Each structure stands twice: as C-alpha cells, then as structure tokens.
Design a protein around this nucleic acid. Structure first.
Lengths: 332, 84, 332, 84
DNA sequence: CTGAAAGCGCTTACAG
DNA sequence: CTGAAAGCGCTTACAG
C-alpha cells in the first residue's frame, strides 16, 4: 500500500524492472544482487499488489465458479475439490450461488468475466441453449462440472448419469425385483428426464419389464419430498417391491415413509439411492447408493481448466469419471 | 526404476481428497512416479490420471518410481495407500 | 478487453472522464449526453474492467473469506449466509479452506490481503495469540465468525457457546437426569474446553451434581467418533442416564452406538446434540439439538463488515445472536 | 403509518435464508418498514436487526410501514411471514 | 544479466 | 455539468 516496487528500487539501488524480475522469479538476474533484493522485501514487508500486476500482466491468477447452492452437502464437496486442485496450482477462487435460475447465472457469468478471471468452472442443473451460445464466446476458458449439455461444444467433466441409473436399476432386476418405482427430482432438469429416467426405462424395457406412469413420481429434493412419494406407492395396486431414488436425502425420506407405514426394509422392499453422500451411511438401515465422485468431478474440472489457461495439451473435452454402487443394509 | 505391488487398505480408497492428497504427496519427489491399475497406468503426480482409475478399497496396484529418490518415494507412497 | 472507456470516448464524442461518470453512476452529467453514452455501451458490449478500476479507485468490491472446511454441512450454511448478504451489497467473494492449521491460515490471510481485498470474514477453531496480533494490523477491516478469541480486540459475531451448553445440560437436570456425560470434539479447540466444557460443568456444580472425568470423553468430529464414546459409557459403572454432544453427527453416531448395544432411546437414555443440522431431523429417533444459527452468523458477520468498509456506525463489535433448543424424539 | 400484528406460519420462522429473503423483500418498498417483537422493534430492511430477534414459529409480531407504499408493503410482508 | 520508457484501463481531484 | 493531466503498481518488450 505504501511500500511499492518503486521503494524497493530505492532501498535496493536496483531498477524497478529488476525488483519485478526477482518477485515473479524469472531467472536472469545477478544472484549477488538478487538477494540484495530479497532482503529489502523481507525487511520492508513489501507485499506485492496483485491488482497492479493484473492490469499490467493481463492475467489475474483467479477462476470464478458459478455454483447452484453451496449449502447442500452435494455441491459442498464439489466445491472443495475445485478449491483444492486450484489452491494447488496457485490459482485463487471466486464463488457465488446461481440459485439455479437463469437471469442470475448469465449475470454472475458476465460479471466475473469483467472481474477479469483467467478461467471459469460452471455447474447448473440447466444449461439452456442460450447459456451455451453465451459461454462459447467467453474471452477466457470455460469448463462444466456435474452438468449436462447435449452438444458438447464446451469442455466438461461429467459422469454417465444414464449408465449410473441403468447399472443400478438393473441391480434390482437381477434380484428378481420386477416392480421397481423411481422417485425423481425435478423432472425438468435435463440431468433427469434425459439421463436418469431414460437410464431407468432403458433397464426395464431392455429386460422386458413394463414402463407405466405410476412408478416414476416427482417431488422436491429434500428429505420431506421423499416421505410423500412413498405413501403414494403402498396406497396403490402396483405394489412397489423396491425403489430407485435420484438423491440420497430423498431416499432417506422414503426409507422412513415406509417403516412408519409399518413395512420392513428390505424384506418388504429394497431401496437404492443416488450420490452416496456421507449422509448415506448415516441412515439406518444403511443406504446402498450410486456413487457419484463429486470431490473428483470438481478437482478434475479445475485441474482440466488449469490445463487450458496454461495452454497445455488436452486430449478430450468430454472427460467422464467412472462410478460404482455401495451395497449396504438396504438391499439383499 | 523401483517397483512395488500394493493393496490399498484405504477406506475411501484413492478417491475424494485422499486421492488428491496422494498426488500432492507424490510431488514431493523428483522421481517420475507412476501408478498401474489392472493394466492401465497413469502419472501419479497428475490429478487427471490418478482419478480416472477410481481405485477403491481391496484393489492391489503396482506403483513405479524412477529417479534419485525412487526408494524414498515408493517407501512413502505404498506406505500411505497402506492406510497403515 | 478490446472495447475500452477510450473507445467509448471515441464513439460517444465525449471525454474519457465523461464515460467514467456514467458507468459508476455519479449524478452530474448531461442526461442528454448521458444516454448518448449508455447507447454505445450496450451497442459495443463495453464491459468495464474491474481491475483497471481497482488500481485507480483503490477499492476492489471484494472480501476474502478464510474458512476451515467448506465440505462440512456446518461451514457450508455459514458460507451461504456470508455469500448472500455480500451478493446483496454488490460485494464479490474469495473463498478458501484453512484446513484448520495455522501456517496455512496466516498464509491465506497475507495472500488475500495482497489480492487487495476490501475486507475479510475469518473463522477458525483456533485464534492463536499470534493471528490476533496479526489481524489487528490488517490494512483492511476484519470480522470473525463462529470464532472465539478472548480479548475481543477484533469485531466478531458469535453466539454464547457456554450458555448454549449450559442451557442444554440443564434441560437434562430438570428432567431428573443426574448422571449425564458429555461427548466432546477436539478439547484443544478453545471453543470447547473454554466454552462448552465449562458451560457443561457450570450446570453440574451449579445444581450440585458431581464433575468426574468419566463423563467427558474426546474423539474426532465425525459419525464414527460417536460410536466409540457410547461404548465406553455403558461399559462403565457410572451408568450414563443421558448425554450431551458438541456436534450432531457425533450424537447421531451415539444414538446408534447404544441401540446396537440393545438399549432404547430415551427410555434408557435421553440425548441432546449441538448445531441443529438439517441432519438432526434426519435421524430416527429425531435428535433434539442446541440451535446455532450458522446462516445468520455468516450473514451478520458479512453485513457487519460491509458496515465498516463503507464506514457506517457500529454500535458493538461483539455481536451475539441468541439460541434455543429443538426438542424432538430424543428426550421426554 | 399502517400497522399489523401477524403470526409467522413459517417452519424455520424468520431465520436462516428465509429471514434474509424477508429483508431483501422489504427493500422493494420506499416505505420505511419495521418489525416489532414482544417489545423490541428493528428496521426490517436491515439484516443486523431482523436477525437479532430470532423469531421462531408460533410467535406473533407487529409489523409497521410508513410511506407511499405502506399498504403495498404490509400486504406483502405479512403475507410472506404467513407461510400462506 | 538489465536499465529506460511506454502502457495496462480506469479515477481522481483540478480548472471550467 | 465536465475536459485535460497526472498517477494507480506493476510488466512487457526493447536496447545493453
């Protein structure tokens, strides 16, 4: 603030352009004089001005993250991963919540973009055609996380939500279960009606089981939204022998819905969730869930992004980590 | 070049931050380091790679180290993944 | 990047100093010419450079938050609150994790400080004498969150962890319970051995009950760390009739520890947790917990901080929101 | 100056983000707005104040509005806190 | 290795 | 209302 690169040029009897060379660290100075410069720095408390460096270097060492809601354990981990890999590449971060709505996103976007970010990790449950054609001309590199967008005109690390759903809904089938419903989140989120539902129905039809509109009910994403659906199933003639859920909490609120109706899990019904949240092992019975490595999805998207700003070699802009299933006390 | 096949007594295995720590741990060595998994091997100082294998508990994997501190490296890495 | 305030000075036939007046919005320009300026801006796509404005205004419109670990639901909410109140005052944010260790904190600090933040919300489980005397001379305003630091030389919004503990440990007492243990987190965190434990023991001694070192056991902060402690209590002669826990998860892992030992909650033991996490209502039985308004603690600390940068009137630098208790199925 | 005593059918009450939304909602009115709670009343367009009362479910509170849009304001605020 | 100079895009006081 | 000028702290090419 008061001690500049100028005042080091003073106490160092060197040139302002010298002082810069030492801080940034570019080899090419007299070590004999170099240290002459590293002394004053420690001696004066000279903290370089990241801003002054920004205007002149045309780079900031900062990525901006647009994330739905940092208060949900789900996006939480995702955030850490991004934060970590970034803190590892000496890249600082700018975070904010998009509340999932559009006119707030494009805003955060265009904003950060003016803050001069050197990059952007962006994740939303809805990547409207608009945003794509918007991100596409961003002056700085972009990379999506946990997000789905059909064209693939933008680099993105994501997992195969369809297989995920499929490979789980099948688990049920191989266990004889021929009447398994699916408790889903907002059906409008393409990462549901275009990935999970199809992955769900792909498993039924593929093995020759029905596909009626009485096994796939909607509802919000929290605990409660799961207590409802359950009720709707027992109180119906297509007795659901088991259920697939696109969120752990939801499931957790379905396990309960049923025990309150006196039924026993799994003797009366096996239930498999989605995400494998630390919350998963928290329930009783223990919830078997579809693993979605969020910490990894975030770490990769950032790491990938750094491998763009620094202009390294990308071999694929469609990265997909794998998945599994953690069988527990909710299934045979 | 020093080699070793190891289990991975880790509870989360080589995923989540543990994974991420493994990589930062790997970089404390000048020795090019690697990790083989059932056939595919990636750079162990690279987050991209290590995380693409998604190595969970119970899996045994070969780790490779070639450099001034290959023993030192290996000593630590295998050690870490050993949970023990 | 290519369209500057200069190029608007061009297409607007106005002065560079004119163009500035309009963007920042300071009344004092010819509305007739003002609009002449707002047109080119929309017409050219002129996005101002937040950096150039930063070097010249000596203000950035950004606070930096130092937080322990953004992956724990606890700090999660705390983050949202800070993020919200900030996004409300048009103030951008920079987040990072201190992993709770010191040489990483002072680093994040001194770093952000060089990034030129206009302020800092800082929360850690340990505010060593060092950091204080360090924060104290920060060139920009600081404010602590959920954090404890005895001297009070730094503005901070916090709740009364002692009362909290007291007013909860008493609940037990009025319910006859005279043998209640306390499952605590890291005892070394002053926000435990200097706030909760005393608040715990203040309740015992005050009502004339004992205070033996066989009711207050340590253990990590997660689910598991709670399964242990429980075991240590049943398998002991000072039969714990109930237990107080400094974290919900921990408790949640104690409720279980006991049912697995066949005992019944609460007939065999009432248990009250701490934080009142959304995870609280997730358990079965439902966990009665000490309410700690995190979303509020964060929103206040930021809001307060804004009411410092803008140099408004502060009436207290020791803000404390209140607390309560959410009785549920874990107590009579 | 328009006044009204209201319940607060809110589940979280006036805390957490709901609270925070209440305040932003309040600012969509030019009318100085206020909220009284069992005696202490604070500015309802101020986060500091509103949050210091920690108004939980079941509590009844008087809300005050004085300005061009006091009816409009009040209409909305009470409405919001009504959960309904 | 290494000075001197020009320039990053905006703002801030100073004269109209 | 409103120009012209100087200045924010660093860097980046350009001559030693």
């Amino acid at each position: 603030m008061n001690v500049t690169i100028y005042d080091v040029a003073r106490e160092a009897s060197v040139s302002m352009a010298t002082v810069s060379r030492v801080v940034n660290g570019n080899p090419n100075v007299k070590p004999s004089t170099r240290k002459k410069v590293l002394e004053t720095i420690e001696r004066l408390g000279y903290r370089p001005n990241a801003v002054a460096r920004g205007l002149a270097s045309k780079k900031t060492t900062t990525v901006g993250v647009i994330i739905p809601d940092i208060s949900n354990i789900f996006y939480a981990e995702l955030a850490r991963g991004i934060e970590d890999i970034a803190s590892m590449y000496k890249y600082n971060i700018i975070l904010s919540n998009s509340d999932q709505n559009q006119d707030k996103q494009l805003h955060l976007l265009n904003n950060m973009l003016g803050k001069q970010v050197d990059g952007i990790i962006f994740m939303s449950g809805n990547v409207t055609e608009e945003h794509v054609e918007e991100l596409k001309k961003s002056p700085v590199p972009v990379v999506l996380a946990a997000s789905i967008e059909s064209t693939n005109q933008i680099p993105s690390v994501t997992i195969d939500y369809e297989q995920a759903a499929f490979d789980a809904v099948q688990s049920l089938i191989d266990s004889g279960h021929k009447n398994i419903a699916f408790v889903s989140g907002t059906l409008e989120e393409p990462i549901n009606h275009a990935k999970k539902v199809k992955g769900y129905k792909r498993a039924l039809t593929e093995s020759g089981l029905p596909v009626r509109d009485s096994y796939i009910v909607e509802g919000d994403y929290t605990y409660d939204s799961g207590i409802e659906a359950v009720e709707k199933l027992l109180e119906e003639d297509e007795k659901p022998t088991a259920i697939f859920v696109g969120t752990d909490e939801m499931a957790l609120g379905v396990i309960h819905g049923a025990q309150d109706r006196g039924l026993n899990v799994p003797n009366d019904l096996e239930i498999i969730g989605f995400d494998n949240t630390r919350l998963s092992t928290m329930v009783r019975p223990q919830l078997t869930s579809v693993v979605q490595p969020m910490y990894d999805i975030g770490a990769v998207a950032m790491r990938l992004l750094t491998k763009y700003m620094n202009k390294e070699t990308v071999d694929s802009s469609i990265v997909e980590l794998p998945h599994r299933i953690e069988f527990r006390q909710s299934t045979k | 070049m020093v080699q070793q096949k190891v289990e991975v007594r880790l509870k989360t295995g080589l995923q989540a931050r543990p994974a991420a720590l493994f990589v930062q741990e790997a970089n404390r060595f000048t020795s090019d380091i690697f990790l083989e998994k059932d056939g595919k091997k990636v750079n162990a100082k690279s987050i991209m790679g290590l995380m693409s294998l998604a190595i969970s508990t119970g899996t045994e994997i070969t780790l490779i180290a070639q450099g001034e501190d290959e023993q030192e490296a290996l000593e630590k890495l295998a050690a870490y993944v050993q949970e023990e």
